[PDB]
Every structure is written in structure tokens, then in C-alpha cells.
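Hi W., the 6-nitrobenzotriazole complex you wanted:
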Amino acid sequence: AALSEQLAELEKRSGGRLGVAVLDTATGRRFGYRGDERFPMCSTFKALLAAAVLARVDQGKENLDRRITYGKEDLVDYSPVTEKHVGDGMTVAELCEAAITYSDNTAANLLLEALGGPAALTAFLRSIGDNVTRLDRWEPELNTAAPGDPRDTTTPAAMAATLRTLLLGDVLSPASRQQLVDWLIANKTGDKRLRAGLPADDRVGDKTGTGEHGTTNDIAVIWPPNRAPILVAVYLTESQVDADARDAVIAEVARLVVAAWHH
Ligand SMILES: O=[N+]([O-])c1ccc2nn[nH]c2c1
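Structure:
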């Protein structure tokens, strides 16, 4: 009857560990289910990576139009955008778009290099008040999702709070803020997850993640019509159901949250 026990049932059926955080900016109303447990980020870190790059652009230490050249030797598996541009390279802006909207692994690695590595991303997160999220490794090894491993993890509550600070706070310039929002709104990988359980008229930006040990994640900023945005972070790991069913778990979280929020 309570959202918390609805999620426990759903978590039971998934065979894994489910983490949910909701941060409604209209009210400050938070919700958490395992909100302070660590979960593997997998590709959800790429939303933070893009923010860190934009911070440099605001600082004048990076330009969105700067062209990065690379080769076949740089290509990491699942690189559907960067694999097409070994011959002409891609700009920093194009790499951010590829990392966010397609989870392009090579794009993420090239942006990490422009930033100074996973330690540089973690330091950026510390500088903006996130004392929990950490990136340690590169693509594709950060997707190992080994239980009990703190490397490359966040908590649902910390991720939602960090998304609020970056997408709605003062950390980024209004131009960079809107650009990060625009990239998330254009995401191509999340049609079967949170989006599949949200009202059709909701405006959604999201970043998915997928990894070993049955790991399937989705984090989002959501604008209901004529309403302040809501930040949602859903992490599922150690799952024992197949890929489509893991997607369905995330969609059902969105359905249960909206229902619980409207009644
Ligand atoms: O995902 N949500 O947290 C969420 C909550 C309430 C809503 N009303 N419309 N869409 C919503 C999404």
C-alpha cells in the first residue's frame, strides 16, 4: 500500500537490489528506497562527466568546438557514434552528446582524458558538495559492478542531489545548464526504462547505465506540465531476470512513483 512496500515487492520479483531516490523540487519532498546504499553507476556517470566538462567551458579552460582526433586504437566496444568518425574526429560538444545520448564508451574515455581522468571527475564532484559519488576506472572496466566493490559507485540519494545541483543550481552557467539539459532530453537509450512508465506529456531528460551482474540503471530530470522539475535516480543490480525484464523493473518504478506522487 505504501510506495516503500510496493518497491519491496517489485525488488523481490527482480531477484536483485533496487535503489530509488526522488527529489521533487516543487516541494523539497524526498523519497528513498535504499537511497543511501552504494550501487554501480555504469554509464550514469556520463551525465556528471559532461557537467564537469561544461564547468571547464565556463572557466575558459575548454571549448565545445574544439576538435579531438582519435584512431581505431582508441575505440572501446559499444561506440556507435565515435566508430563513425575515426577519419574526421569529433568536437567536445559532439563527444558529450554521444556519451549522453548513446552511452558511447569511446566518447566518454576521450572526455575523461580532456578532463584529467576519473580522479579529476571525482574532485569536481567533491567541489560541488557530493561526498559520496566516485569514479575510479575507465571504460569499459568501470562496468564490472562486482558486489561489495566501492569503485565507480554512487547512491541513489547522492545522485539525485547532484543532479539537482548541476541541472538547477548555480554550478554551471545558464547556457551550460541548458546544454546539459538539452543533451539529456535527446537521450536515445532510455525508451524502455523510466520513460516507459512516465506520463506522455512529461518532459524527460535521462541517462541510462548497463553493466555486469544484472545491472540496469536510469537517472532522470522530469518536468510535469506546469510544474517544477523532479529528479529521479533508479539503480538495479544483482538482478536475476533478463535484460527486457530489468528494463521493465525501471519502468514500473516510474509508474509506482507517479501513482504514489499523485494520490
Ligand atoms: O518520476 N517522478 O518522480 C515523478 C513524480 C511525479 C510526477 N507527475 N508527473 N510526472 C511525474 C514523475
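Helices lie at 3-14, 45-59, 92-102, 105-115, 118-127, 156-168, 174-185, 243-262.

W.
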